[PDB]
Short mmCIF file of C-alpha atoms in Angstrom, two decimals:
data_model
loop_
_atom_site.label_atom_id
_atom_site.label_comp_id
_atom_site.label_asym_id
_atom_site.label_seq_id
_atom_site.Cartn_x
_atom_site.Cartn_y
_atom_site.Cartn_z
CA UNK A 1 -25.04 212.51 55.71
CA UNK A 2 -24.14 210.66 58.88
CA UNK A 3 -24.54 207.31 57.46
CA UNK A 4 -22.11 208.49 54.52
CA UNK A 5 -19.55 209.66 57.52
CA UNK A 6 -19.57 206.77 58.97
CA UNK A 7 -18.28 205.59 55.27
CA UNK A 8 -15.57 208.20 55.17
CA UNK A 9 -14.65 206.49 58.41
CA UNK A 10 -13.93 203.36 56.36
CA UNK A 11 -11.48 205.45 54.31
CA UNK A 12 -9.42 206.22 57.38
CA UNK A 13 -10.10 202.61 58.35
CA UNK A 14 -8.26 202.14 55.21
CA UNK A 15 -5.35 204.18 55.72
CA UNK A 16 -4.95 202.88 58.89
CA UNK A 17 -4.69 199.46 57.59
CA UNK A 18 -2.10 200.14 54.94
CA UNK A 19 0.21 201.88 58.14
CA UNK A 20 0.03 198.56 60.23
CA UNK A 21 0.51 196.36 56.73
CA UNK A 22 3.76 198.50 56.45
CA UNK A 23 4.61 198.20 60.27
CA UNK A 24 5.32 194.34 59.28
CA UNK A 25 8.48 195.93 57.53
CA UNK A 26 10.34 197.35 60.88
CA UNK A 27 12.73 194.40 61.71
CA UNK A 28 13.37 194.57 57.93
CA UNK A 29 13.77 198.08 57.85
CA UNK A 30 17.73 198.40 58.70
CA UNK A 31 18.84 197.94 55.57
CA UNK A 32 16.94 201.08 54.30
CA UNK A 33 18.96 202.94 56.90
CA UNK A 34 22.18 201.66 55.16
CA UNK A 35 21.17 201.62 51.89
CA UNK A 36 19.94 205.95 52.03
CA UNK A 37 23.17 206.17 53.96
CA UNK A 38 25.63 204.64 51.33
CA UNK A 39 24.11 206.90 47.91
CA UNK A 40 24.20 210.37 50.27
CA UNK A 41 27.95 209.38 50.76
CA UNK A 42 28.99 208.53 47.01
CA UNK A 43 26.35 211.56 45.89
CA UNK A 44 28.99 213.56 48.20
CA UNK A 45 32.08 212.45 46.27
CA UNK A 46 30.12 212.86 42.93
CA UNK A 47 29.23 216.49 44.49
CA UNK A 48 32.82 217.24 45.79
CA UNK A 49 34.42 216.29 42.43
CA UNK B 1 24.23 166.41 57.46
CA UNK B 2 27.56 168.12 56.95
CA UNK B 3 25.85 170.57 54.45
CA UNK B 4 23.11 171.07 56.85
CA UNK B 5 25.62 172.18 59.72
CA UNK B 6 27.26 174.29 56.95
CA UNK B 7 24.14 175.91 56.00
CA UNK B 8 22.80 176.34 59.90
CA UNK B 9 26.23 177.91 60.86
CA UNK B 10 26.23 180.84 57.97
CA UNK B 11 23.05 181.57 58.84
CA UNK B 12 23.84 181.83 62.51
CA UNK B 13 26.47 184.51 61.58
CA UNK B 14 24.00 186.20 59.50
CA UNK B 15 21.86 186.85 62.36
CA UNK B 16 24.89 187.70 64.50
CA UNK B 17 25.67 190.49 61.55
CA UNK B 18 21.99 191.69 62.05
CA UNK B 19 21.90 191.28 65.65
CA UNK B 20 25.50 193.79 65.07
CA UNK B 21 23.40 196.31 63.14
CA UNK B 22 20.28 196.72 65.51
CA UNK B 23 23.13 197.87 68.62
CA UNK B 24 24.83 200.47 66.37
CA UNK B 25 21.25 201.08 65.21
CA UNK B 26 20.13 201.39 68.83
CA UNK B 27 17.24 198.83 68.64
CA UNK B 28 18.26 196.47 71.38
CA UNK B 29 15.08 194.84 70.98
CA UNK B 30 15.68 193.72 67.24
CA UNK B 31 19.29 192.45 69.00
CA UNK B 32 17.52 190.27 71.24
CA UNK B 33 15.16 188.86 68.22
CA UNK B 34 18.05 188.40 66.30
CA UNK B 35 19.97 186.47 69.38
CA UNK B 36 16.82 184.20 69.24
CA UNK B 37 17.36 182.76 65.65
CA UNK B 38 21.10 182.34 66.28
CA UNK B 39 20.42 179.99 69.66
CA UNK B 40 17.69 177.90 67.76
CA UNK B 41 20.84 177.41 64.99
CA UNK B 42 23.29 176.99 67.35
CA UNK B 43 21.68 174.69 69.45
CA UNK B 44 20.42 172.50 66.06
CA UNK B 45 24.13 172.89 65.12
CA UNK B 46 25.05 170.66 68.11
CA UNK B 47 22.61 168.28 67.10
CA UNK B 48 23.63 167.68 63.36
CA UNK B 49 27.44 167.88 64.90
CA UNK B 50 26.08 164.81 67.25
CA UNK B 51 24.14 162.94 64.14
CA UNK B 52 27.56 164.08 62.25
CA UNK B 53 29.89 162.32 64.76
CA UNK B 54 27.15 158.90 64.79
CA UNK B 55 27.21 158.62 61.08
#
């Protein structure tokens, strides 16, 4: 059992690794902020009508 | 070397637009990356503009 949770600790190794992979993205990232931005404001006018 | 300062220059203002969009995004620190890779184009700008003015 404690060499198999040192394993699971390789699964949140894992995760980990994906989160700092995605991290790369930040600088990048602005143009989510504008794009989720834009479609709430048309999604308004599509509401409002 | 025309097309090069051409191509250097828009992409100087494209980084100025981005530079633009990390203040009213308050991430002065993405300003000052973007600042960066408009001097390096600037500054190769005056170069081509000097290899421009030779040729």
């Amino acid at each position: 059992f404690e060499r198999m949770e040192n394993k699971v600790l390789d699964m949140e190794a894992t995760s980990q690794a994906a989160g700092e992979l995605a991290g790369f993205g930040i600088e990048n990232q602005f143009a989510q902020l504008e794009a989720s931005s834009g479609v709430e404001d048309e999604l308004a006018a599509l509401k409002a009508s | 070397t025309e097309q090069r300062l051409n191509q250097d220059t828009q992409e100087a203002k494209k980084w100025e637009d981005r530079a633009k969009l990390a203040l009213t995004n308050g991430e002065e620190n993405l300003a000052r990356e973007a600042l960066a890779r408009k001097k390096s184009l600037t500054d190769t700008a005056a170069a081509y503009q000097t290899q421009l003015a030779q040729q």
